[PDB]
Design a protein that fits this description.
Chain A: Keywords: Nucleus, Repeat, Ribonucleoprotein, Ribosome biogenesis, rRNA processing, WD repeat. This is part of a larger assembly, with chains A (816 residues), B (85 residues), C (233 residues), D (285 residues) and E (63 residues). Chain A is α+β, with helices and mostly antiparallel strands and 816 residues long. Chain A is built from eleven helices and 58 strands. Classes of the chains: A alpha+beta (816), B alpha+beta (85), C alpha+beta (233), D alpha/beta (285), E mainly alpha (63). The structure holds one RNA strand of 30 nucleotides.
Chain lengths: 816, 85, 233, 285, 63
RNA sequence: CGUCGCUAGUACCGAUUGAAUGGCUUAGUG
C-alpha cells in the first residue's frame, strides 16, 4: 500500500506550557506540543519555529502518542533552552543551533518546574514524581537528587548553590542543605496544598488553595536548629482561587517592590511592598489613631502586629484579561510603567502595559499593547472541511470561522459566526455553509468576506449535521428538531421544498456520491436509507449498540460504514442491508470515518486520540498513526485523496499526506586485597619512621568482614575448610587488625569467635609446627582482648539476670 | 513468650523481633513489605451443581425484585449532546 | 435510621444538613445532599419535644421529657484547629529527629524517638551510640536521659527490649539498656509500675539462654592456649 | 461468587410424571409451528422441554427449583438445541415475560389461577396454551352457564378466551401420588381482545356472584353494595341513596334480569346488565 | 523443553498474559492457533519418515 | 528482590450553549 505521514502541523500558538520571554517591547517563545514556537509580541506573528524532528506519521516515530513539552525554561547568558516533556525527558536546546544540545532522561513523570543556575553548569529539575534531580549540563549527569517530598514539586528556588528551598503540592516547604543532601527544616507552607513560592531578599511568600497568602522570613545564618523558616502574618487576597506562579520586580533606583500572582482564573492579582519609612510613617499614624480611640499601650502594640502584614505591602493594581491565563511572566521593569506577557488557555497571547507613579497607577484599567490571534483559534475545531479545489481548508468552531491556505498554513480569511456545529463548502470555492446550535444557518462568500444570508428559524433546534447533493442544488439538513429539511438554492437565497418526519433526532446526514439515495442516522441506534429521487424509505441498518456518529458512502455506492459510540466500526451492504464485518478499532468512541476517494479504504478518528487507516478488502488497520494528545473531533479527506486533515482538542491542526566466585573463594580474594592493604599501611608507616576499597568507602578490615558476613553460614564451614594455611595466616592478621578496632569487634563478636575456633581446630597440627615468634604475639594479643570482650558481655548478662529475678521476688512479697 | 503481630495498628512487628512503625519507613521499603506480605497470603452436592449453573452461559437468574442477573451476580445485558460531544 | 419516631426536624448549615430528634432520645445529624447520618448525638435518656437552633444551627438546645436541658455547641473548626496544631508539632519533631541522627546527637535523638515511638530509629540511636561508647553504660548524658523517663516511657522501652532480647543477633543492645535502668533508677519503683512484671517475666528465660551461650563461646576459647602451650614446647 | 448471589435469591430447599403418552399427547396437541418460540413453564428434568426444542425455533424455560434447572442444563449441554434454550430461574409472575406464540406448562398448581390471567393480560398473548391443571380448578374453567361449577372464574376467563378439555390424568401417573386428580386443558386467547373494561367486567361479576344461586336482585340488596355503588355514582356526577335504589330497580326490571340467578346466566346476560347500568349512569369499576 | 517453546510461541502472538495491561486482531490470533497446533505435533521437532500411515489410508477412502 | 496491575482516598486538565443557586446590571412590567 501507500504509507501516510504528517507533513506540517499548525493552528495552535502554544500548548498549556509556561511562557518564556526574551527582551527585544519584547519577544515570547512558547511551544506547541512537542515543537517550540517563537512569537514576537510587537508583530503578533512567529519569527521562527523550533522543531525537534522525527515527524509524526513516519516509521521511526513511536506508536504511542508523543509527549508535549510541559515546561520551557531559558538562560539568556548561555543562550540555552531547557525543555521538559510529559514522559520526563529533559532536552537542552540552543536557539541558535536549532537542535537539541543535550538529552536527559531521568524523570518518570513530566517536569513541573526548571531553573538554570547563573553558571549554566547545573540545571535544577522538578518533576511530578516527587523527586528533584540536580542535573549538570557540563557534567552530563545528575550529581544528586532530593526525594524527601511526598508529593509533586510545585516550586523550588536556588540562587546560592549552598542552600535550596522547595515547595510541594502537599504543602510542606523544606529548606535543603545541598552538600549534605538533607532537608534542613520542615514546616507546612499551608494547611491546604501549596502551589506558588517566591524568595527575594529575606522575604518569602507562598500561596495555597485558600485565598490567604502566607508571608515568611528565613535567616540563612540562624543555625538555631529550629524556626529556620517562620511566618509573621497572612494577608487575605480577593481571589479565592490560588496562584500558580508568583514573580516579583524591583527597581534599584525606585527602591520599590512590585509583583503579580498568576491565578487559575482570568484575573491576575498583584501586590506591592510598601516603602519602609512610609511604613514607619504609617506605624506612627496608627499609634496616633489608637490614642484617640483610647486603646491601652498593650492594645496599641497588639494592633500593630495584626496589621503588620498590612503595613508591609499593598495592592498597586489588579490586572484583568479577556481569557484565562495558563502562565504569565514579568517582562519589563520601570518606575514609570510595567508591561507583562501572558499566555491564555484559549491559545491567544495577550500583552498588557500599565503606567504608574508613586503609590497608585495612573491608568484606571490595564491596556493591551499587542495580541497574537492571527494563528490562534479560541475554541477546538468541531468540524473541518477540505475545499474541492484542494487549496483551501475550512475550519469551524464556536463563535469563529477560519479559512486556512494549505501552503501558507496561515489564515487567509476570518469570519465571525455562532456556535457552528458542522461546516460545508460548496463546489468551486465560492461559498461555505455553517450550522449553529442556536438554529441559524450561516452562509458566507470568500470574495464578499461576509455573511450573505442567515435564517435563524431554519431549524428550531440545533442543526447537528449538514450535507449537499452532488449537483449542489439541494442542501440536506439534519437537526435535533427530529425533521430532515431540504433547502434549494435560487438566484442567491435558499427556500424550503420538502420536510421528512422522523421518530428521533438526526445525528448525521450523508448524500451518496452518485446522489441516488440519502442515509440518515437517529438516536434509537438505527440507521435508515431513503431514496433521494423519491424520498421513499429503502432499507434500514439495525443492531448498533450505541448511536452512529458518522456515515460515509463509498464511491461505488455499494457499501456504507457506520461509526458509533459503541467503539465498533461496521461496514454495511446496501444491496441487502447486511453487515459484512464489524471491528473494535478504537478504545473510545469513534467520531468520523471517511472513505478514501476511489478507494474502499478509510481513515478513522476517535476520542482516544488514535487515528487509523483501514483496508476495505483486508478489513484491517493498514496504518496506526498517533499524533494528537486529545480527542480528534473531525476528519476530512481531499477530493484527490492526496492529503487528509484532522483536528484535536489541543487546537493543533495536522496535515497528513502520503509519500563466578564460589563461597569461600570470594573470601580468599577479599582477604588478599585487605591484607595486602593493611600490610602496606603498616609498611608505609615503618618507612616514615586499591580502587575497589575506595568505592566501597569502608575500612580494609571492614570490607573483608562484610564479605565474611555475606557468606552464608551453611557454606561457611566448608569455606574455612577449603581455605589453605597461607591464607589462614593472613586471616589471623585480619582478626588482629579488627581486634584493634574495638567497636567492630563487639558488633560481630559471636561470628568472629566461631570462625576462629573452627580454623584453629581444623589446622591445629599446622599451627603448632610453625616457629614464627611473631605468630605467638598475634595469638597472645587476640586472646587477651577476646577474653575481656567475652567476659564483659557475660558479666553484663549475669548482672542483669540476678537483679532481674530479685525484682520478681520483691513484687511477689509485696502482693504476698 | 513469643513474638507476634504488632499491638499498635500503625506498626508492623515481625517474628524476627523487630518492630516497624509505619511513619518512619521510606516509600520503597513500604512497597516491598507490602509485596512481602502479598506472597505470604498468596500461598496460604449443592456446590457441585452451582458451578454447573455458573458454568453454563444460557442461564438467567431472577431475584425477588424481578430483575434479571447472571449466575455471577451481575445484571445480564441517551443524550444527543453527550454522544456527539 | 431512627429507631423510634422523629418528632422534630430543623435545617442547619443552611441547605447542607438537617438535624432530627428521635423518640429514642437520639439527635441525628444528616447531610441533606447525600441524606446520610453524619453524626448521632445522645444527650438524653427520654423522648424529646423541643429542638431550638440558632446561628444556622451553631447552637442547638434539646429538652428532655424528664426535665433535663442539654445544649450542644458547634466545635468543628475547634477540633480541626486542634488536629492541625498536633500535625505541626509532629512534623517538626520528625524532622528534628532526622537532623540529630545525621549529626550524631543520640541523646536528643533518643528522647525524640521515645516520644514518636520509632523502633528502628530507637534501634539505630542505641545501636550506634553503643558503638561510640565502645570506642557509664552508654555515656554520661544519655545515661542521664535514661534516668528521667516516666513510668509510661519505661514500660514502652521495656516492651521493646523484650522483643529485642529473643533474637540472638540483637540481645546485646537490650541488656545494656536493662543494665542502665537498673543502675539509674530505684529498683523498688520499677516494680509498682503496672504491667512491668509481666514484661519482666519474658526477659528472664531468654536472658538465661544467652547466658548459657557466650559462656560456651568463652569455653571454646582455650583452644588458643592449647595452641600456645603446645607449640611453646 | 456464584454461591454469593444464588444463595441471596434462593434457600435451595414435587410430583413427577411417569407416563410417556401424556407428554407425547401434550406436545402433539400443541401443534407447534417451526417458526414459533415456546415459553415452557415447569421444565422439570426436561422430558417435555427436549421434545419442544426439536420442533421449535426457540424455547424459553422458566424454573423455580435451581436443582431442576441444572438437570435441564446438563441434559441439553453440547447438543444442537443448546443454542435454542434460554433458562430463566426464579419467580416469573413478577417479571415481564418475553414474546411467545405457544405456552406448554406442567404448571405449579399454586400459581394456576395467577398464570391463566397473566397469559390473558400478556400483551399480544399466545395463540394457544396447553396448561395442565387439577380437576377442581380446571372444571371451573370449562364450566358452562347453568352448571354447578359455573363461577366468577369461569365467567371472567370465558370472555377473554376459550378453554377446552384435552385429556384426564390419573393420580397414579405421578409419584409421590398427589391427593387430587389432574387434567390437561387448551386455552385459546381471543384476538382481538373483546373491548370491555377489565375492571368493569369484574365489578359486575363479583357483586352478583357473592351468592350465585341467589337472585341478582338480592345481590344488590346488601347495604354495602349500595354504599360502594352510591359513591361510584357520586364520582360520575363529580366529573342520593334513594335515587341509586330507584335506578337499580328500573335496570333489573327493564332487563328482566332481577329474578334470575348468576349461576344460570350467559355472557350476553351480564353484558346487557352491564349496559343498563351504564345508561343510567352507574359504573361498577 | 517443548513446554518452554510453547509459552514463547504463544506469547509472541499475544496468546498468553493479561489483556488489560496499561503502561493483534482476533482472527489472526485464530490463525496463530492453527499454526501452533500443527507445528507442535511432530507425529503428524519433526518425526522420522514412516511413522504415520495417513497417506495410505486417505488414498484408499478415495477408492 | 523487581516491573505492570486491581481497591480506597487527595487533589489536577478541559469539554459536556455542563446543570442548579445567589450578587449586581441591560431592557420590558410594576
Amino acid at each position: 500500500y501507500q504509507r501516510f505521514e504528517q507533513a506540517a502541523a499548525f493552528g495552535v500558538i502554544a500548548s498549556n506550557a509556561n511562557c518564556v520571554w526574551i527582551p527585544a517591547p519584547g519577544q515570547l517563545i512558547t511551544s506547541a506540543l512537542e515543537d517550540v514556537n517563537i512569537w514576537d509580541i510587537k508583530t503578533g506573528d512567529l519569527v521562527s519555529k523550533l522543531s525537534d524532528g522525527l515527524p509524526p506519521g513516519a516509521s521511526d516515530a513511536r506508536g504511542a502518542k508523543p509527549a508535549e513539552c510541559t515546561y520551557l525554561e531559558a538562560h539568556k547568558d548561555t543562550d540555552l533552552l531547557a525543555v521538559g516533556y510529559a514522559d520526563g525527558v529533559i532536552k537542552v536546546w540552543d536557539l541558535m543551533s536549532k537542535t537539541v544540545l543535550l538529552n536527559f532522561n531521568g524523570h518518570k513523570a513530566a517536569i513541573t518546574l526548571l531553573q538554570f543556575d547563573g553558571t549554566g553548569t547545573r540545571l535544577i529539575s522538578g518533576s511530578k514524581d516527587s523527586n528533584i534531580i540536580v542535573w549538570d549540563l557540563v557534567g552530563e549527569v545528575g550529581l544528586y537528587k532530593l526525594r524527601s517530598h511526598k508529593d509533586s514539586i510545585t516550586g523550588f528556588w536556588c540562587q546560592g548553590e549552598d542552600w535550596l528551598i522547595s515547595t510541594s503540592k502537599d504543602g510542606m516547604i523544606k529548606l535543603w542543605d545541598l552538600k549534605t543532601h538533607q532537608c534542613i527544616e520542615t514546616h507546612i507552607a499551608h494547611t491546604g496544598e501549596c502551589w506558588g513560592l517566591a524568595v527575594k531578599d529575606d522575604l518569602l511568600i507562598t500561596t495555597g488553595t485558600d485565598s490567604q497568602v502566607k508571608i515568611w522570613k528565613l535567616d540563612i545564618e540562624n543555625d538555631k536548629m529550629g524556626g529556620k523558616l517562620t511566618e509573621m502574618g497572612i494577608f487575605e487576597k480577593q481571589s479565592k482561587q490560588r496562584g500558580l506562579k508568583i514573580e516579583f520586580i524591583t527597581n534599584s533606583s525606585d527602591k520599590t517592590s512590585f509583583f503579580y500572582i498568576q491565578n487559575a482564573d482570568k484575573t491576575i492579582e498583584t501586590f506591592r511592598i510598601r516603602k519602609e519609612e512610609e511604613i514607619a510613617r504609617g506605624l506612627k499614624k496608627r499609634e496616633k489613631r489608637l490614642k484617640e480611640k483610647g486603646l491601652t499601650e498593650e492594645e496599641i502594640a497588639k494592633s500593630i502586629k495584626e496589621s503588620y502584614s498590612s503595613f508591609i505591602l499593598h495592592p498597586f493594581q489588579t490586572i484583568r484579561s479577556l481569557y484565562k491565563i495558563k502562565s504569565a511572566s514579568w517582562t519589563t521593569v520601570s518606575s514609570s510603567k510595567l508591561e507583562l506577557v501572558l499566555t491564555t488557555s484559549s491559545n491567544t497571547i495577550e500583552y498588557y502595559s500599565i503606567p504608574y507613579e508613586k503609590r497608585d497607577p495612573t491608568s484606571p484599567a490595564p491596556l493591551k499593547t499587542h495580541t497574537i490571534e492571527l494563528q490562534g483559534q479560541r475554541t477546538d475545531v468541531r468540524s473541518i472541511d477540505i475545499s474541492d479545489d484542494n487549496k483551501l481548508l475550512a475550519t469551524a468552531s464556536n463563535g469563529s470561522l477560519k479559512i486556512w491556505n494549505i501552503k501558507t498554513h496561515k489564515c487567509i480569511r476570518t469570519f465571525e459566526c455562532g456556535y457552528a456545529l458542522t461546516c460545508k463548502f460548496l463546489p468551486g470555492g465560492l461559498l461555505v455553509i455553517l450550522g449553529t446550535r442556536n438554529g441559524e444557518l450561516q452562509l458566507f462568500d470568500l470574495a464578499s468576506s461576509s455573511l450573505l444570508d442567515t435564517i435563524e428559524d431554519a431549524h428550531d433546534a440545533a442543526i447537528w449535521s449538514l450535507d449537499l447533493t452532488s449537483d449542489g442544488k439541494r442542501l440536506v439538513t439534519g437537526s435535533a428538531d427530529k425533521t430532515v429539511k431540504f433547502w434549494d438554492f435560487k438566484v442567491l437565497k435558499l427556500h424550503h421544498d420538502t420536510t421528512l418526519e422522523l421518530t428521533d433526532d438526526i445525528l448525521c446526514v450523508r448524500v451518496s456520491p452518485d446522489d441516488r439515495y440519502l442515509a440518515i442516522s437517529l438516536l434509537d441506534n438505527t440507521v435508515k436509507v431513503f431514496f433521494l429521487d423519491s424520498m421513499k424509505f429503502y432499507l434500514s441498518l439495525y443492531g448498533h449498540k450505541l448511536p452512529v456518529l458518522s456515515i460515509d458512502i463509498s464511491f461505488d455506492s455499494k457499501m456504507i460504514i457506520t461509526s458509533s459510540a459503541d467503539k465498533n466500526i461496521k461496514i454495511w451492504g446496501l444491496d441487502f442491508g447486511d453487515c459484512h464485518k464489524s471491528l473494535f478499532a478504537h478504545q473510545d468512541s469513534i467520531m468520523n470515518v471517511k472513505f478514501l476517494p476511489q478507494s474502499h479504504n478509510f481513515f478513522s478518528c476517535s476520542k482516544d486520540a488514535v487515528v487509523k487507516y483501514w483496508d476495505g478488502e483486508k478489513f484491517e488497520c493498514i496504518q496506526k498513526l498517533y499524533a494528537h494528545q486529545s480527542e480528534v473531533w473531525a476528519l476530512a479527506v481531499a477530493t484527490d485523496g492526496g492529503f487528509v486533515v484532522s483536528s484535536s482538542h489541543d487546537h493543533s491542526i495536522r496535515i497528513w499526506e502520503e509519500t563466578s566466585l564460589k563461597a569461600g573463594e570470594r573470601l580468599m580474594e577479599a582477604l588478599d586485597l585487605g591484607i595486602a592493604e593493611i600490610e602496606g599501611l603498616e609498611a608505609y608507616n615503618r618507612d616514615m619512621k586499591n580502587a575497589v576499597l575506595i568505592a566501597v568507602n569502608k575500612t580494609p578490615e571492614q570490607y573483608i568482614m562484610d564479605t565474611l558476613l555475606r557468606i552464608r553460614m551453611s557454606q561457611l564451614e566448608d569455606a574455612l575448610m577449603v581455605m589453605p594455611f597461607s591464607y589462614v595466616l593472613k586471616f589471623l592478621k585480619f582478626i588482629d587488625t579488627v581486634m584493634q578496632n574495638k567497636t567492630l569487634l563487639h558488633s560481630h563478636l559471636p561470628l568472629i569467635c566461631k570462625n576462629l575456633f573452627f580454623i584453629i581446630k581444623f589446622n591445629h597440627k599446622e599451627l603448632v609446627s610453625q616457629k614464627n615468634e611473631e605468630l605467638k604475639l598475634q595469638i597472645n594479643r587476640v586472646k587477651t582482648e577476646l577474653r575481656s570482650a567475652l567476659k564483659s558481655t557475660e558479666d553484663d548478662l549475669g548482672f542483669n539476670v540476678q537483679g532481674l529475678k530479685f525484682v520478681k521476688q520483691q513484687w511477689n512479697l509485696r502482693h504476698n | 513468650y513469643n513474638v507476634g503481630k504488632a499491638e499498635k495498628d500503625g506498626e508492623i512487628r515481625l517474628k524476627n523481633g523487630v518492630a516497624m512503625s509505619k511513619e518512619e519507613l521510606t516509600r520503597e521499603d513500604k512497597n516491598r513489605l507490602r509485596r512481602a506480605l502479598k506472597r505470604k497470603r498468596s500461598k496460604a452436592k449443592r456446590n457441585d451443581v452451582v458451578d454447573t449453573l455458573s458454568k453454563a452461559k444460557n442461564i438467567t437468574v431472577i431475584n425477588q425484585k424481578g430483575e434479571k442477573k447472571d449466575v455471577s451476580g451481575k445484571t445480564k445485558k441517551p443524550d444527543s449532546t453527550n454522544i456527539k460531544l | 435510621g431512627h429507631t423510634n419516631a422523629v418528632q422534630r426536624c430543623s435545617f442547619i448549615n443552611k441547605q447542607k444538613q438537617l438535624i432530627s430528634c428521635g423518640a429514642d432520645g437520639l439527635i441525628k445529624i444528616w447531610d441533606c445532599s447525600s441524606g446520610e447520618c453524619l453524626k448521632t448525638l445522645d444527650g438524653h435518656n427520654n423522648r424529646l419535644w423541643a429542638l431550638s437552633t440558632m446561628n444556622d444551627g451553631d447552637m442547638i438546645v434539646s429538652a428532655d421529657a424528664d426535665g433535663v436541658f442539654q445544649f450542644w455547641k458547634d466545635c468543628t473548626e475547634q477540633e480541626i484547629e486542634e488536629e492541625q496544631e498536633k500535625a505541626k508539632l509532629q512534623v517538626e519533631q520528625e524532622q528534628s529527629l532526622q537532623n540529630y541522627m545525621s549529626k550524631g546527637d543520640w541523646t536528643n535523638a533518643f528522647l525524640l524517638a521515645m516520644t514518636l515511638d520509632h523502633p528502628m530509629r530507637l534501634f539505630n540511636v542505641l545501636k550506634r551510640a553503643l558503638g561510640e561508647s565502645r570506642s557509664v553504660i552508654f555515656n554520661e548524658e544519655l545515661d542521664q536521659a535514661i534516668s528521667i523517663l516516666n513510668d509510661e516511657q519505661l514500660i514502652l522501652l521495656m516492651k521493646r527490649c523484650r522483643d529485642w532480647n529473643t533474637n540472638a543477633k540483637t540481645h546485646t543492645i537490650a541488656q545494656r539498656t536493662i543494665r542502665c535502668i537498673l543502675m539509674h533508677h530505684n529498683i523498688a519503683k520499677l516494680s509498682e509500675i503496672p504491667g512491668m512484671v509481666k514484661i519482666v517475666d519474658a526477659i528472664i528465660p531468654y536472658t538465661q539462654r544467652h547466658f548459657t551461650r557466650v559462656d560456651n563461646l568463652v569455653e571454646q576459647s582455650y583452644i588458643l592456649d592449647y595452641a600456645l602451650v603446645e607449640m611453646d614446647k | 461468587s456464584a454461591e454469593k448471589h444464588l444463595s441471596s435469591v434462593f434457600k435451595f430447599n414435587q410430583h413427577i410424571l411417569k407416563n410417556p403418552l401424556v407428554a407425547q399427547g401434550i406436545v402433539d396437541k400443541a401443534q407447534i409451528r417451526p417458526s414459533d418460540v415456546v415459553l415452557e413453564v415447569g421444565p422439570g428434568t426436561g422430558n417435555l422441554t427436549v421434545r419442544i426444542l426439536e420442533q421449535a425455533k426457540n424455547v424459553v424455560a422458566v424454573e423455580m427449583d435451581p436443582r431442576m434447572a441444572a438437570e435441564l442444563t446438563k441434559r441439553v449441554r453440547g447438543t444442537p438445541v443448546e443454542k435454542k434454550l434460554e433458562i430463566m430461574l426464579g419467580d416469573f409472575m413478577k417479571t415481564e415475560l418475553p414474546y411467545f406464540d405457544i405456552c406448554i406448562s406442567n404448571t405449579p398448581y399454586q400459581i394456576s389461577s395467577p398464570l391463566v390471567f397473566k397469559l390473558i393480560n400478556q400483551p399480544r398473548p399466545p395463540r394457544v396454551s396447553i396448561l395442565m391443571f387439577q380437576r377442581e380448578f380446571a372444571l371451573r374453567l370449562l364450566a358452562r352457564p347453568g352448571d354447578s361449577l359455573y363461577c366468577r372464574l369461569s365467567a371472567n376467563v370465558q370472555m377473554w378466551a376459550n378453554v377446552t378439555h384435552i385429556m384426564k390424568v390419573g393420580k397414579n401417573n405421578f409419584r409421590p401420588p398427589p391427593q387430587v386428580e389432574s387434567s390437561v386443558v387448551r386455552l385459546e386467547i381471543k384476538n382481538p381482545r373483546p373491548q370491555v373494561d377489565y375492571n368493569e367486567w369484574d365489578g359486575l361479576l363479583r357483586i352478583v356472584f357473592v351468592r350465585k344461586n341467589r337472585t341478582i336482585s338480592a345481590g344488590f340488596k346488601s347495604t354495602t353494595v349500595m354504599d360502594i355503588l352510591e359513591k361510584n355514582y357520586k364520582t360520575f356526577l363529580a366529573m342520593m341513596h334513594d335515587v341509586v335504589k330507584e335506578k337499580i330497580d328500573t335496570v333489573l326490571k327493564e332487563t328482566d334480569l332481577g329474578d334470575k340467578r348468576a349461576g344460570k346466566c350467559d355472557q350476553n346476560d351480564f353484558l346487557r346488565l352491564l349496559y343498563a347500568f351504564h345508561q343510567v349512569g352507574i359504573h361498577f369499576s | 523443553s517443548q513446554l518452554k517453546n510453547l509459552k514463547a510461541a504463544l506469547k509472541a502472538r499475544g496468546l498468553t498474559g493479561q489483556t488489560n495491561v496499561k503502561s493483534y486482531d482476533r482472527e489472526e490470533k485464530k490463525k496463530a492457533i492453527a499454526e501452533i497446533r500443527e507445528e507442535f505435533n511432530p507425529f503428524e521437532a519433526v518425526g522420522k519418515p514412516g511413522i504415520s500411515k495417513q497417506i495410505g489410508e486417505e488414498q484408499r477412502k478415495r477408492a
